[PDB]
Design a binder for this molecule. Structure first.
Ligand SMILES: Nc1nc(=S)[nH]c2[nH]ncc12
Ligand code: NI
Ligand code: NI
Length: 330
């Protein structure tokens, strides 16, 4: 019920935060894992915004309020949580640093914010679930149900007193960045990814792709959003494997709810079908992750390390299937 707001202590603490110097170098790399630095997550996001956009891009007090209120509006769910938000924003930072002048100042600030916000107030349930059981959100948002909600949550937080980091934009640029953010969040609906990637692949392969064309830019930004959202598959194997445990914790909890409503869940969401997980991961990588990073690398060549890491993880799932897995901790 309603939008949560950070405390004075929370945002003033972020304002005074300083990032250890050794991490500065590490944060630039695609494979960086925020996992071991939880106390530093909000500060890491400030650092990224300041490196990409400038220390004066946002009023610091508004930015710190905004960040700490965003954190407070992620729920304590196993996967679609604050840690996921900051991970996705970091991937976007790495993409932006490596492709910096392809994107306008307004796009960079909008996309880093969109990434931080893109799963706001997620409940640990899929679009499939909300629509199957006619949750009020599915009535309000007929397609891309949760993503429309995440964008609405974003605008609610911006509207809190002292939280509007974009107020100093011209009236025109303000409308433009909100549209950047809306499009980017909606693009995180994997339903839309399949069509988007196929279109981009064609535009790329025929040579019609043109970044001066707004609809092309929109689609490229779309694919960047998918690549950042799925970036757990681009980390080192043990990190990827641990994150998969969190994703499946959510999936199995949803499947449990469907059993109670008289419907057998898809196997992926069935905690009594964990034997099918390795094959399911293979399916996901071949159908979703590999094509995403393949097309992204064609369009943005500096992103190739995402693709190489994704391929390496695909090989690991293949090893799991062949019974070659070694010791794992969870
Ligand atoms: N298998 C999957 N892995 C990730 S990171 N996300 C997913 N969404 N749906 C399936 C999966
Ligand atoms: Ni999402
Ligand atoms: Ni997400």
């Amino acid at each position: 019920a309603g939008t949560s707001i950070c405390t004075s202590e929370e945002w003033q603490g972020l304002m005074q935060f300083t990032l250890p110097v050794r991490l500065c170098k590490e944060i630039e790399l695609f494979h960086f894992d925020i996992g071991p630095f939880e106390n530093m997550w909000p500060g890491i996001f400030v650092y990224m915004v300041h490196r990409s956009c400038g220390t004066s891009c946002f009023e610091l007090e508004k930015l710190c309020r905004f960040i700490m209120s965003v954190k407070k509006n992620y729920r304590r769910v196993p996967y679609h949580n604050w840690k996921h938000a900051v991970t996705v924003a970091h991937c976007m930072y790495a993409i932006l640093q490596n492709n910096h002048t392809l994107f306008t100042d307004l796009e960079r600030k909008g996309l880093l914010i969109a990434c931080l916000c893109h799963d706001l107030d997620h409940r640990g349930f899929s679009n499939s679930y909300l629509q199957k059981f006619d949750h009020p959100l599915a009535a309000l948002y007929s397609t891309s149900t949760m993503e429309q909600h995440h964008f609405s949550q974003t605008v609610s937080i911006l509207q809190l007193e002292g939280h509007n980091i974009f107020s100093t934009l011209s009236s025109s640029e303000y409308e433009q960045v909100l549209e950047i953010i809306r499009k980017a969040i909606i693009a995180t609906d994997l339903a839309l990814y399949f069509g988007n990637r196929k279109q981009l692949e064609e535009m790329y392969q025929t040579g019609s792709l043109n970044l001066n064309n707004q609809s092309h830019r929109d689609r490229v930004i779309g694919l960047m959003m998918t690549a950042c959202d799925l970036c757990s598959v681009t980390k080192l194997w043990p990190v990827t494997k641990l994150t998969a445990n969190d994703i499946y914790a959510e999936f199995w909890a949803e499947g449990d709810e469907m059993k109670k409503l008289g419907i057998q869940p898809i196997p992926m969401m069935d905690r009594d079908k964990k034997d099918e997980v390795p094959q399911g991961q293979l399916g996901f990588y071949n159908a979703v992750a590999i094509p995403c990073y393949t097309t992204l690398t064609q369009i943005l060549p500096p992103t190739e390390p995402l693709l190489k890491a994704c391929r390496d993880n695909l090989s690991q799932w293949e090893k799991v299937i062949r019974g070659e897995e070694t010791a794992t901790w969870i």
